[PDB]
Amino acid sequence: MLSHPPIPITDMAEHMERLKANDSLKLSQEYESIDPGQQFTWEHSNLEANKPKNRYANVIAYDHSRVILQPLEGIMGSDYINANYVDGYRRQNAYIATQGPLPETFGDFWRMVWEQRSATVVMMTRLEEKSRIKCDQYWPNRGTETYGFIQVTLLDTMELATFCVRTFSLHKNGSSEKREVRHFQFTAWPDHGVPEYPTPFLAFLRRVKTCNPPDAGPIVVHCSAGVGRTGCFIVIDAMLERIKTEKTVDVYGHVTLMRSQRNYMVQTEDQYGFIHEALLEAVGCGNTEVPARSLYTYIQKLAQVEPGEHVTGMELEFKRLAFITASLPCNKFKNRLVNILPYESSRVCLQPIRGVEGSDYINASFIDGYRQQKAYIATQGPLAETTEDFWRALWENNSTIVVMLTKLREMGREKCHQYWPAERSARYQYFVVDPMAEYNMPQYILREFKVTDARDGQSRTVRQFQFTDWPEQGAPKSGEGFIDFIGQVHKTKEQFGQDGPISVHCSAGVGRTGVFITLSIVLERMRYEGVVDIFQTVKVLRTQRPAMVQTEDEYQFCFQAALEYLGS
């Protein structure tokens, strides 16, 4: 367009900075100007038989773009569903944007999927968000359920930390045909505003796109109203497909086109900003995922210096990986480093003492696992005047497993303050720690403790694992000892009935800590999904705590452990 021309990649970051400038003013003016410049009708949405088929009276389906169901003759309005075709870039009716189905429209929705020959459904919402129903569950808990003319059979569930994948079989009334449909529910969108980092969503999108067949009907996408998160998903995807052919981006143009196909597509200014951030991150972070039996080949490639390039592929890839409530003038003793600090939206909150303002801070960040959120806590190795807060932190967060990743002293220097007793009892503020058992294993030491609350008298078992075999300088040549150590901690977690996060630290609590959480994730995804993407794994971790996996040597070791684990 004239007024809003395409944004070429490599001029994108400066475009977003110009949009962000002075309280997102240019973005605000860009977003407020969005107008397809046409008049539409919505007579079908307004038929009195169809009125109650709308979740929101104010979110309707335009006539010219509506999804038309085959009429159930004898029944007026039976051709109506609140849904519209929406274009991709160079992709006519690539998507169907629709509301979250209502109890009364379950059958209509599944009949739409059938008649439109769709194969993928994208659900951009949790069923309930902040005690408010955003969508009703339109699929069986197990086995088969009938909705109108469609039998829906749940075949499988795969439930990860940020999204859940369900597989279904569809069988229609009499019809001998059987259709398969895959259902992707992103569950990590925040209750208010948009995600702080686009990385987890972008991984959700890749998953969706690799598992959607290429000869299927339009991807069905919905949230609650099917305009807001739905719109974000559609534009992100379309623009990713755009840069694949044009190396340019036209968010402005596409949203305008979407608005001509469904009301309010991309509902808020925040969503419009989020779309840009997600696309900026995506252009500088390319494909780094590799299938299992190509990992060695891929590792063999990164281990090499390319003609005309200065350092190994492993080195460049690692180079491409680059709050205030913590940095208060009172916390200038609570941190080992003033340059390695937890983020706000992840930092572990300590229940504050009656009359000590500024003592809720502990250098610890919540970290999501592979299957569940907040599966880990990434913290620094405690200091003398930090010890008390660490034991405090463990109790309040139901963390009954500690993972230490350093020797107490390395290279003629302390790395961590011994925070646990060895030969007596030790009262740390309102807690007392009993050394119960101590096992010396080959690569690590397991220490059992009896933390008893001095206030309410309650006692908990805390098992501490300390890996003793990390070379004083560099990385292990074999991952075997680390693979097993990772194994043992998680084995110990489950069989002891420990429904709480695993606390992990090293010295600063980023370098070997990052390596531990990374491989814990990578090794389980490799077992189930059969693919490896360590780059994106470190990227996500870094969006929950900064500097995770501190060095090139740590980074390469993740690959070493992955390659060895595949061999086993």
CA nearest 94: which of 243, 216, 225, 250?
A: 216
Count of domains observed in the chain: 2
Resolution (A): 2.4
Any alpha helices (H) in 47-125, and if so which ranges?
Answer: 106-115
**362 and 279 share a domain?**
no
**237 and 268 share a domain?**
yes
Name, in order, each residue with C-beta under 8 angstroms of 55's C-beta and a sequence gap of 6 or more: 82, 99, 100, 102, 224, 225
Q: Out of 135, 416, 506, 558, which one is annotated catalytic?
A: 506
Q: Of the residues 230, 265, 287, which one is the last residue of a structural domain? A: 287
The rounded distance, in Å, linking the Cα atoms of 251 and 567 is: 45
Spatial contact of 181 and 118, defined as CB atoms under 8 Å apart: yes
Largest CA distance in the chain: 87
The rounded distance, in Å, linking the Cα atoms of 201 and 193 is: 14
**301 and 377 share a domain?**
yes
Q: Is 506 a catalytic residue?
A: yes
SS3 breakdown of the chain: % helix, strand, coil, rounded to 5? Answer: 30, 20, 45
Strand positions, DSSP E, 468-561: 502-505, 531-532
The rounded distance, in Å, linking the Cα atoms of 296 and 312 is: 15
Two tokens, residue 266:
């991309």
Indicate the helix (H) or strand (E) that contains 563: helix 552-567
**266 and 299 share a domain?**
no
Name, in order, each residue with C-beta under 8 angstroms of 530's C-beta and a sequence gap of 6 or more: 291, 292
Spatial contact of 96 and 67, defined as CB atoms under 8 Å apart: yes
Beta strand 376-379 pairing with 364-367: antiparallel
Any alpha helices (H) in 142-286, and if so which ranges?
Answer: 199-210, 229-243, 251-259, 269-284
The rounded distance, in Å, linking the Cα atoms of 226 and 123 is: 9
The rounded distance, in Å, linking the Cα atoms of 18 and 13 is: 9
The rounded distance, in Å, linking the Cα atoms of 377 and 368 is: 9
Spatial contact of 362 and 390, defined as CB atoms under 8 Å apart: yes
The rounded distance, in Å, linking the Cα atoms of 160 and 529 is: 11
Q: Of the residues 270, 287, 304, which one is the last residue of a structural domain? A: 287
Please, is 528 exposed, middle or buried when counting C-beta atoms within 10 Å of its C-beta (0-12, 13-18, 19+)?
exposed
**172 and 272 share a domain?**
yes
Sign of the Cα pseudo-torsion (521, 523, 524, 527, in order): positive
CA nearest 12: which of 248, 244, 192, 239?
A: 248
Q: Is 285 a catalytic residue?
A: no
Spatial contact of 226 and 97, defined as CB atoms under 8 Å apart: yes
**242 and 351 share a domain?**
no
227 is in an annotated binding site: yes
The rounded distance, in Å, linking the Cα atoms of 251 and 258 is: 10
In degrees, rounded to 5, the angle at the alpha carbon of residue 557 between the alpha carbons of residues 484 and 501 is 55
In degrees, rounded to 5, the angle at the alpha carbon of residue 374 between the alpha carbons of residues 368 and 379 is 90
CA nearest 509: which of 411, 395, 356, 393?
A: 393
Helix (H, G, I), strand (E, B) or coil at 545: coil
Strand partners, 86: 95
267 is in an annotated binding site: yes
Residue 432, domain CATH: 3.90.190.10
Q: How was this structure determined?
A: X-ray
Sign of the Cα pseudo-torsion (233, 155, 67, 192, in order): negative
Q: Which amino acid is at 291?
A: P
End-to-end Cα spacing for the chain: 56
Sign of the Cα pseudo-torsion (542, 545, 549, 552, in order): positive
Alpha-carbon distance values, 118 to 63, 95, 215 (Å): 21, 9, 10
**33 and 164 share a domain?**
yes
The rounded distance, in Å, linking the Cα atoms of 154 and 167 is: 6
Q: Of the residues 239, 262, 287, which one is the last residue of a structural domain? A: 287
226 is in an annotated binding site: yes
Two tokens, residue 248:
């340019």
191 is in an annotated binding site: yes
The rounded distance, in Å, linking the Cα atoms of 567 and 565 is: 5
CA nearest 263: which of 464, 97, 494?
A: 97
**292 and 303 share a domain?**
yes
**121 and 231 share a domain?**
yes
Q: Which amino acid is at 172?
A: K
**55 and 194 share a domain?**
yes
Please, is 174 exposed, middle or buried when counting C-beta atoms within 10 Å of its C-beta (0-12, 13-18, 19+)?
exposed
Domain that holds residue 33: 1-287
**294 and 271 share a domain?**
no
**342 and 272 share a domain?**
no
The rounded distance, in Å, linking the Cα atoms of 465 and 463 is: 7
Helix (H, G, I), strand (E, B) or coil at 240: helix
**Computed over its alpha carbons, how large is the radius of gyration of the chain?**
27
Q: Out of 223, 232, 416, 558, which one is annotated catalytic?
A: 223
224 is in an annotated binding site: yes
